[PDB]
Enzyme design. Sequence first.
Site, PDB file in Angstrom:
ATOM      1  N   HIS B 128       9.812  -2.936  -7.609  1.00  0.00           N
ATOM      2  CA  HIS B 128      10.331  -3.690  -6.466  1.00  0.00           C
ATOM      3  C   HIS B 128       9.655  -5.074  -6.485  1.00  0.00           C
ATOM      4  CE1 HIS B 128       9.283  -5.122  -2.305  1.00  0.00           C
ATOM      5  NE2 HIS B 128      10.599  -5.125  -2.185  1.00  0.00           N
ATOM      6  N   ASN B 130      10.023  -8.972  -4.151  1.00  0.00           N
ATOM      7  CA  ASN B 130      10.623  -9.745  -3.084  1.00  0.00           C
ATOM      8  C   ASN B 130       9.841 -11.057  -2.998  1.00  0.00           C
ATOM      9  OD1 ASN B 130      10.620 -10.777  -0.286  1.00  0.00           O
ATOM     10  ND2 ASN B 130      11.774  -8.957   0.220  1.00  0.00           N
ATOM     11  N   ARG B 132      10.279 -14.575  -0.294  1.00  0.00           N
ATOM     12  CA  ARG B 132      11.074 -15.002   0.850  1.00  0.00           C
ATOM     13  C   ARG B 132      10.367 -16.118   1.632  1.00  0.00           C
ATOM     14  NH1 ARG B 132       8.738 -10.338   2.015  1.00  0.00           N
ATOM     15  NH2 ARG B 132       7.633 -10.036   3.981  1.00  0.00           N
TER      16      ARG B 132
END
EC number: 1.3.3.3
Lengths: 325, 325
Positions: B128, B130, B132
Amino acid sequence: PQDPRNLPIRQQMEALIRRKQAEITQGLESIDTVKFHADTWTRGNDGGGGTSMVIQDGTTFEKGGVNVSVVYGQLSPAAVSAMKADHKNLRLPEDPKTGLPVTDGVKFFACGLSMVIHPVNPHAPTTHLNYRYFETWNQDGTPQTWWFGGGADLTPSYLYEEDGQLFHQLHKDALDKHDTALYPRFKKWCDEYFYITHRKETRGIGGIFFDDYDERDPQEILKMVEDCFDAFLPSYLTIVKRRKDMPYTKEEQQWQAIRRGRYVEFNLIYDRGTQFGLRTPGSRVESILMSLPEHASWLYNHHPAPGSREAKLLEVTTKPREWVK
Amino acid sequence: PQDPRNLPIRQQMEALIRRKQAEITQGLESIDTVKFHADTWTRGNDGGGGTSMVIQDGTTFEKGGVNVSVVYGQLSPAAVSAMKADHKNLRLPEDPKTGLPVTDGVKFFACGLSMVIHPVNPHAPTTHLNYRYFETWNQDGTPQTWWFGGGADLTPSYLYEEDGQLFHQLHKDALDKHDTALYPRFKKWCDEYFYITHRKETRGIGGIFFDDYDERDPQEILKMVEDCFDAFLPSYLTIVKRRKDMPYTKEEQQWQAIRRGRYVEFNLIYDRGTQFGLRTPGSRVESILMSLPEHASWLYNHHPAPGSREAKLLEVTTKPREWVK
């Protein structure tokens, strides 16, 4: 020992749920080739215990449990407070200048049976059942506040209209022996509780559901609970017997598995019993998660074909329909 | 085109994650035989929309997504207070008396890339990533409150120490280029964030995690994000290349499935970005839930044998270790 009814409601309920655990697992075993396996636990004198009964990897049932649980305990006016949004009559407010926050920790007794059964065959539905009772104690161990909760519900992947009719009919018949008003209300309630908000659909075709039910004389509610228990085997076994040996494709196995993911999503996101269980350090995690199926699947942006059997289920989960009479 | 470093941070971040979405998907495609498919939606004159690139039924990846979301909107205290828990400079204080609370709204922008990849082979780990960015706006459209969040992490079912070391090391190397305090801090945070409380273990072996990060000039943080992005393909492609063709058994696939069940429990009960998404109006549920694997399993009371490779994973998820030069 003779003359039941004489006996305290809490002890009457315990004995009923223990007999039904035995009767229901025996019923279910009769259409499989494997047995439920019992494990027992305690918190002795301190606060109770239970009996879990699990079936796995059967020719008929892939995974299921029929659990009985008994709890003698203390309840803080802090935690008491929170469980008033759901339960009328419960007491100890910490008031705008009165109440009775006797601090302290009021005693409570709770017991129930909780069961979830997941068949191997895509055409044989998942079901769930729960009947439970709760009370607070007045310094002298007698019931101050009390109620029953429970219900049973059905979770097909493939909709068979006869199966939905039989299931809902026999639970209506059970509740109609006590009050014709309940089925319509409890059926509705069950359409609403099992709604997976973010999926805009229920996990199955419902059944009956209720909670905080204290409207009649506890002795009468006990007979209601018994008749409700007895709606289960005559519908569910009948249903499984005629689905379990239907043939299934890998695509039908896929659809079941998708519907098992929906089940997981409900239980892990929306289920009040579950959330509470998993919170609470030292809880029986395996027991509370025995509701989860052995297998589930998630497909990205999956949508069944219009007019498919898979889409026919969706019509009824997104728009809950009536099942009998 | 002009010097991109002259553009507003929101625009530079949008551009970076759109480039990385393309670069990462192409990278992953380079070790499969199947392609990611793209879907792109728009929020019209509300701005902006999103793009999901998803793979299903690859020879290397069973399911994966690399998703980009850009949002423009108005925060109503429905979050400006409900986000404050995790965000220390956020800002619309409905005061005990003085400080200026709004009514009114604060405009915001948010954008990010989110990816979860699940390999076919039990020996190749789930991962995973991410990165942002979030900002509220002044009346003139300039940023008022802002922060970056992100990280990446690795989720093996079968523990291979060298994979853990490379994944952690390349991410440590990325962060060390900017500041040597960040990796210890973000490594630990990752150990903590992916803890499945009721299971008393993390889902995998961590990596790096941060949120609410606003401790430097956002332009330097942009460059940190880029180098972190760049730790991913060199670790993960190398790892997968040396795992994807390893032989595996039915029993190894069962353990993978069990670990995927743990992954689901984490994402549906503890993951904050998942909770937020399932609860926000006009959220793309399918985007939000694409992190869930194609298959997962739940077994009642499963415990690997003492000394097994399965138990060796549990050593490291129940008690985090270090991985780095």
